[PDB]
Short mmCIF file of C-alpha atoms in Angstrom, two decimals:
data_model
loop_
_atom_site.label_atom_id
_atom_site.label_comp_id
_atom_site.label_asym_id
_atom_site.label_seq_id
_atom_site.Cartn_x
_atom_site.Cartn_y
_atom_site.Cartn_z
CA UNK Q 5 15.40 36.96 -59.88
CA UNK Q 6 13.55 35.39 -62.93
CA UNK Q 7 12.07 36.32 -66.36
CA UNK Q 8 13.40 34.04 -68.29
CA UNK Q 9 11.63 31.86 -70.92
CA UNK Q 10 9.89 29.08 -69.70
CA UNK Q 11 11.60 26.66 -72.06
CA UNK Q 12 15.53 25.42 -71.88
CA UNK Q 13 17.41 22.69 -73.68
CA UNK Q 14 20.25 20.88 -72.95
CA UNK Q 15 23.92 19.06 -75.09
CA UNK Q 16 25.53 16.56 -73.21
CA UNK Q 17 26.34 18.01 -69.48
CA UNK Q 18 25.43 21.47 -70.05
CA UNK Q 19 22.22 23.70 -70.49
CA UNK Q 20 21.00 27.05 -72.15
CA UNK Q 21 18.16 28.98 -70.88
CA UNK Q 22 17.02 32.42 -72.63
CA UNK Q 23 15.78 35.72 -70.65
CA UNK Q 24 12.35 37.58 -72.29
CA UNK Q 25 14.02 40.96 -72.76
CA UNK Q 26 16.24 41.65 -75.06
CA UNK Q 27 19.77 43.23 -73.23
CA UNK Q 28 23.00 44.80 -73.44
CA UNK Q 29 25.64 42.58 -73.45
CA UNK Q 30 26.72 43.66 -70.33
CA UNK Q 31 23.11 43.97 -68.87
CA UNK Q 32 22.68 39.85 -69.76
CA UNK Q 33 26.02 39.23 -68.32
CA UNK Q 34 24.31 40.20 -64.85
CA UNK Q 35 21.53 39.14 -65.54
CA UNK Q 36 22.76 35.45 -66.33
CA UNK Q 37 24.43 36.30 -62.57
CA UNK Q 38 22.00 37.25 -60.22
CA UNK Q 39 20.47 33.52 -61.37
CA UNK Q 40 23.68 31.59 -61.02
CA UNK Q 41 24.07 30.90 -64.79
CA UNK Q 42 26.49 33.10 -66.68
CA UNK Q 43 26.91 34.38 -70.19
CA UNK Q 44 26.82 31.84 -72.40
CA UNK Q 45 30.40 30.04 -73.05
CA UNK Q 46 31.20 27.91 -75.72
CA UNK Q 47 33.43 24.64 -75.66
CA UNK Q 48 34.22 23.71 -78.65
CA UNK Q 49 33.27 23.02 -82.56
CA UNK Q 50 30.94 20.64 -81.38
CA UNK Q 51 28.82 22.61 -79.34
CA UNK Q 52 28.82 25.35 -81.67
CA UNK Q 53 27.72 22.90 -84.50
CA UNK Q 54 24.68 21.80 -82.31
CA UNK Q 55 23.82 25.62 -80.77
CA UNK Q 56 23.34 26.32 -84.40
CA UNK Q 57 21.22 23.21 -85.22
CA UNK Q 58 19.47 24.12 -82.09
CA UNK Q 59 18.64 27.42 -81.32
CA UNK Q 60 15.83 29.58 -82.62
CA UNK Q 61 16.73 32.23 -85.70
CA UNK Q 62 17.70 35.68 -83.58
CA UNK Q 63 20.92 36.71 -82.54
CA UNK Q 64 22.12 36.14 -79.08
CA UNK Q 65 24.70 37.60 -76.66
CA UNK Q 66 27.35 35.06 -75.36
CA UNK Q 67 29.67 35.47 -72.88
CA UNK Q 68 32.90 36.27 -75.40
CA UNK Q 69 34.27 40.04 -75.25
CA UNK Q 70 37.34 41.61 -76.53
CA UNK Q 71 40.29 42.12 -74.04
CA UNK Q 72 42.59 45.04 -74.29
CA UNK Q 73 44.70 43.64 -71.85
CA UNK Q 74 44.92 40.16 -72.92
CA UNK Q 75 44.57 41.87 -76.89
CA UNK Q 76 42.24 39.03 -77.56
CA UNK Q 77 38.95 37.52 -77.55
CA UNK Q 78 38.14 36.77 -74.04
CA UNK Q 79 35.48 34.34 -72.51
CA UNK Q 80 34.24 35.89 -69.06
CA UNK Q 81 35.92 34.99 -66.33
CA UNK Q 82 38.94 33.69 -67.63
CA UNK Q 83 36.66 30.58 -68.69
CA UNK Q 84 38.80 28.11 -71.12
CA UNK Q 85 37.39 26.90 -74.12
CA UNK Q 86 38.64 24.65 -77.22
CA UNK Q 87 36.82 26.86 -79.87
CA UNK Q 88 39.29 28.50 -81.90
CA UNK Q 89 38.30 31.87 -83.02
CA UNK Q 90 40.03 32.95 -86.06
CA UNK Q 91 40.29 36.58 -84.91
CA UNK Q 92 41.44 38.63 -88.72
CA UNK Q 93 36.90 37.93 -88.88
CA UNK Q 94 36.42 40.51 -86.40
CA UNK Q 95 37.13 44.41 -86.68
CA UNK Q 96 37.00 45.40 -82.88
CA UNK Q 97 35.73 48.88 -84.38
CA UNK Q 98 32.43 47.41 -85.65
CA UNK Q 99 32.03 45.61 -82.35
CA UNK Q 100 33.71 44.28 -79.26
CA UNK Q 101 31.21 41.70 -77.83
CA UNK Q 102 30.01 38.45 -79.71
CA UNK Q 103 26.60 37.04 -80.49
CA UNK Q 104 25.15 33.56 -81.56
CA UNK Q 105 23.44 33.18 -84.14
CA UNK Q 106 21.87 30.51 -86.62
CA UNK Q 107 24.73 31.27 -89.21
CA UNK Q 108 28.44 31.98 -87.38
CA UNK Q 109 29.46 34.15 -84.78
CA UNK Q 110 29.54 37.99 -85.31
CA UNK Q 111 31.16 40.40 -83.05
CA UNK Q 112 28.95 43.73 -82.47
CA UNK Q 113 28.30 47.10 -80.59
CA UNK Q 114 28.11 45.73 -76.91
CA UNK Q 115 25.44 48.62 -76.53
CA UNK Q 116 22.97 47.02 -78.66
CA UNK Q 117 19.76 44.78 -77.02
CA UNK Q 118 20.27 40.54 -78.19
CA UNK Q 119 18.20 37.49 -76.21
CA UNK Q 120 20.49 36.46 -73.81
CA UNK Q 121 21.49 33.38 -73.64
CA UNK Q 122 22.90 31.51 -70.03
CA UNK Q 123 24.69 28.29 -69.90
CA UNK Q 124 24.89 26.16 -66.35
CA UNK Q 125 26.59 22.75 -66.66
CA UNK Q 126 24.76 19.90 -64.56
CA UNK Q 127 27.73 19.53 -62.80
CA UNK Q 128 28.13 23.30 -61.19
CA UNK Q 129 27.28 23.53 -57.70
CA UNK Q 130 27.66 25.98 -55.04
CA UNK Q 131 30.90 25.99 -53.14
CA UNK S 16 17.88 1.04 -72.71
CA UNK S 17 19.58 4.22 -74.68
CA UNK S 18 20.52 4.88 -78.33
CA UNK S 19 18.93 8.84 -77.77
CA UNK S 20 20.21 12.05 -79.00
CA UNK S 21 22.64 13.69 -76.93
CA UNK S 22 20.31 16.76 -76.61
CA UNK S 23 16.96 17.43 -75.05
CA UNK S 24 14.88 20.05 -74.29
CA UNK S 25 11.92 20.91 -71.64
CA UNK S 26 8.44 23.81 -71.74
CA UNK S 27 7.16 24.00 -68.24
CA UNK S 28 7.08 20.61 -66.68
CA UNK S 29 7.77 18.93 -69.40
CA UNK S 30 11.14 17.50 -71.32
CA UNK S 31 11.61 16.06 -74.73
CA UNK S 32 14.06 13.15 -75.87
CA UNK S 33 15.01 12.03 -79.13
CA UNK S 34 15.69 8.63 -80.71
CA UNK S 35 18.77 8.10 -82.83
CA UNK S 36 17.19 6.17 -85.53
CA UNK S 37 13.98 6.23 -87.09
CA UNK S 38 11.67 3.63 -86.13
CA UNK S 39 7.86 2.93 -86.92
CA UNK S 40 5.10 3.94 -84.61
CA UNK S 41 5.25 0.82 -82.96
CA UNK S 42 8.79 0.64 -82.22
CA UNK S 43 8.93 4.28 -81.27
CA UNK S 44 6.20 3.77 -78.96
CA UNK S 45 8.27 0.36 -77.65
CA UNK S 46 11.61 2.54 -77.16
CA UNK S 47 10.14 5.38 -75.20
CA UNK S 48 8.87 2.36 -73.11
CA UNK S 49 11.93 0.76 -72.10
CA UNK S 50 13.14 4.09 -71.16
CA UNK S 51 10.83 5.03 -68.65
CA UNK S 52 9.65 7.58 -71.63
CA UNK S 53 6.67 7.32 -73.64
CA UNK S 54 6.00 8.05 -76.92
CA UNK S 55 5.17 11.88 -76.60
CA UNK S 56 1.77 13.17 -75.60
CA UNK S 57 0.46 17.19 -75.99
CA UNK S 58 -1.43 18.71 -73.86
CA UNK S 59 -3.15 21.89 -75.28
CA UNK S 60 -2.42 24.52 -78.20
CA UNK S 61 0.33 26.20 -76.25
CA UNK S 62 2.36 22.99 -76.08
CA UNK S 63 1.85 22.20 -80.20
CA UNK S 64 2.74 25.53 -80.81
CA UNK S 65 5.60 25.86 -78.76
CA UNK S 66 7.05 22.24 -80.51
CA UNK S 67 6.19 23.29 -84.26
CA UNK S 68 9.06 26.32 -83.03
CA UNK S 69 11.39 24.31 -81.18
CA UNK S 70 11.95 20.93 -82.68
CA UNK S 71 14.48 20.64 -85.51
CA UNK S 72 12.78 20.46 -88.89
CA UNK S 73 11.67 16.52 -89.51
CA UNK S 74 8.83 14.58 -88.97
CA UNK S 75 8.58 12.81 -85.43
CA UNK S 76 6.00 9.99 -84.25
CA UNK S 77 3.62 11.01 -81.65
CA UNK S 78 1.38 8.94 -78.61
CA UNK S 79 -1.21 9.22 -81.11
CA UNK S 80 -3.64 6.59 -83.12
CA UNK S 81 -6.56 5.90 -84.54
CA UNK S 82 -8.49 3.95 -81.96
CA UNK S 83 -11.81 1.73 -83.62
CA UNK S 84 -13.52 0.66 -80.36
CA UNK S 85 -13.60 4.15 -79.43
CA UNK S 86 -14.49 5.27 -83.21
CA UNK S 87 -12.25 8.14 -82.39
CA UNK S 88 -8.38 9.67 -82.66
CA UNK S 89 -6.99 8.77 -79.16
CA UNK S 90 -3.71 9.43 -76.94
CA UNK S 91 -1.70 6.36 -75.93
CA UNK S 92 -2.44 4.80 -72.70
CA UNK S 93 -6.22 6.71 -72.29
CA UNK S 94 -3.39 10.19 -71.69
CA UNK S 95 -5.89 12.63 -71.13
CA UNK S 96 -5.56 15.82 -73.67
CA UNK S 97 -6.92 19.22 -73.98
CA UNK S 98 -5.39 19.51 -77.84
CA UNK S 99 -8.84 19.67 -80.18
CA UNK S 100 -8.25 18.15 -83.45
CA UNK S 101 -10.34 18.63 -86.13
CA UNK S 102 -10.70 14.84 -86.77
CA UNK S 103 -12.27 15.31 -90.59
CA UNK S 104 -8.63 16.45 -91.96
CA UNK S 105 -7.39 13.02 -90.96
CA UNK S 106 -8.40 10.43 -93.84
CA UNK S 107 -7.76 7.14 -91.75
CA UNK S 108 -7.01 5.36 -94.99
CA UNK S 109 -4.01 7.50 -95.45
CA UNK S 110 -3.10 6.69 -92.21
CA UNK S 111 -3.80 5.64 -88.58
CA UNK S 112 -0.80 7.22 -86.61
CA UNK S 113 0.19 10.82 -85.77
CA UNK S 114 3.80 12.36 -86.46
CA UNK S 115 4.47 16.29 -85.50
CA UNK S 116 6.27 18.45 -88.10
CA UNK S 117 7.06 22.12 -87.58
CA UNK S 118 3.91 23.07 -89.95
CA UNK S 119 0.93 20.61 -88.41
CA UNK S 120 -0.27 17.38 -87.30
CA UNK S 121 -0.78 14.91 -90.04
CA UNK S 122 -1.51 10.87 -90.05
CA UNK S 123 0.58 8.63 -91.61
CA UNK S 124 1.07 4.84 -92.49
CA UNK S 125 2.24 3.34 -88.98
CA UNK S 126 4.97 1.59 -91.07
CA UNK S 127 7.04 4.61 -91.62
CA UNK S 128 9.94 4.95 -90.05
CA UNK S 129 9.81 8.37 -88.10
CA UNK S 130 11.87 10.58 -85.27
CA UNK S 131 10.53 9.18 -81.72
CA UNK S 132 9.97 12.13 -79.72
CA UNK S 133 9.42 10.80 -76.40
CA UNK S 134 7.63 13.19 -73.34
CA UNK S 135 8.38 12.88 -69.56
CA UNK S 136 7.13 15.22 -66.56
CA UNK S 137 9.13 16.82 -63.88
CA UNK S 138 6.60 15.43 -61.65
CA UNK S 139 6.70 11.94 -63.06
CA UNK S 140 8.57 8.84 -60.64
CA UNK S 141 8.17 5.76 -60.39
CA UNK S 142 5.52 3.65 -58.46
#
């Protein structure tokens, strides 16, 4: 269930809330989950632009992970995004999970605690 | 009815809108209006302080004035407040209207043009 701050903002028809403690990537991922938000994906330049403008200065796990598989920068779930990702900024040995911050995105060891951050469009619904 | 920021953002039961262009304490106060808003009113110490860290860096009108019949600083509308001010940093002939910034409260002539930040509750429907 929830600790999660009690503030939240919102772009257009989607909104970010943060948890209190501070998480592995994969430990936010679930934790987004159990709540019915997920890992924060990003949609485009855009949104980006404004999470930057928005957001206060930390660093903060998103829901963007290399794939072996795929041999790519993957958002969970398959989830499809317009924000191209020019990938030659990332060495996969220095990290292989991304955070937000104020400045750019940054890839990093998916072992280390960041605020997590959990998007939920307006329009998701059970089904 | 509309010209507001595309983003938003809530504390508690509380959410927080934002004009598009700067408008003078009058006209901000106006706008909220005719959106069912109202120019924005804090509560305590935990609200200002939680603002000062949220709100992008600028200087925003606030639902508060110089009132002479009650001799006093007062909220729009009678809004009832638990914020203390200490009234003798506010030289009235520097000013008779409020705007936030991220450091402080200050007054300022009710001419300027300013950032509207307009409050509405959860809670709050119409009657």
């Amino acid at each position: 269930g929830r600790g999660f701050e009690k503030y939240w903002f919102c772009y257009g028809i989607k909104c970010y809330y943060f948890v209190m403690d501070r998480k592995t990537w994969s430990g936010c991922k679930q934790t987004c989950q159990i709540s019915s938000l997920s890992l924060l994906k990003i949609d485009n330049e855009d949104e980006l632009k404004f999470l930057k403008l928005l957001v206060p200065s930390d660093s903060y796990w998103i829901g963007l992970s290399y794939d072996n598989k795929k041999k790519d920068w993957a958002w969970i779930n398959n989830g499809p995004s317009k924000l191209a990702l020019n990938t030659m900024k990332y060495n996969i040995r220095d990290g292989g999970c991304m955070l937000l911050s104020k400045t750019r995105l940054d890839n990093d060891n998916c072992d280390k605690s960041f605020i997590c951050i959990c998007g939920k469009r307006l329009d998701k619904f059970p089904h």
